[PDB]
């Protein structure tokens, strides 16, 4: 039975490996989702910023027009 215990060790190792893969794929999935959300947010913010710049440009223009 000196060998069966090594087969047990083998099985434990294959389990550990499997669990590792599952945790890694879950982390990669969360991160991908994160990067997606952040990209959407940064696109909306970038839009807001652009619009605000346009507005400020017009206000400044008018202000100068009344000098």
């Amino acid at each position: 039975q000196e060998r069966i215990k090594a087969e047990r060790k083998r099985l434990r190792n294959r389990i550990a490996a499997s669990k590792c893969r599952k945790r890694k794929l879950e982390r990669i999935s969360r991160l991908e989702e994160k990067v997606k959300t952040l990209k959407s947010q940064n696109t909306e913010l970038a839009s807001t910023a652009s619009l605000l710049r346009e507005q400020v440009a017009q206000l400044k223009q008018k202000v100068l027009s009344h000098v």
Binding site: K24, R27, I28, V35, L52
Partner: protein, 55 residues
């Protein structure tokens, strides 16, 4: 007494999680700065409007 399994686990194929985590960092910072400049642009907008009605 199996922490070694976890360590070598988080050492295998690090390129993916590394790239996704770095991109996550760059996007978090890009976001923060965008929010800041939105705040500043809004302040400037308010300032210009006040100046535009007070003279």
């Amino acid at each position: 007494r199996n922490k070694l399994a976890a360590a070598k686990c988080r050492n295998r194929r690090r390129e993916l999680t590394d790239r996704l985590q770095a991109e996550t960092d760059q996007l978090e910072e890009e976001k923060a700065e965008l929010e800041s400049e939105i705040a500043e642009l809004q302040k400037e907008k308010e300032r210009l409007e006040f100046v535009l009605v007070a003279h």
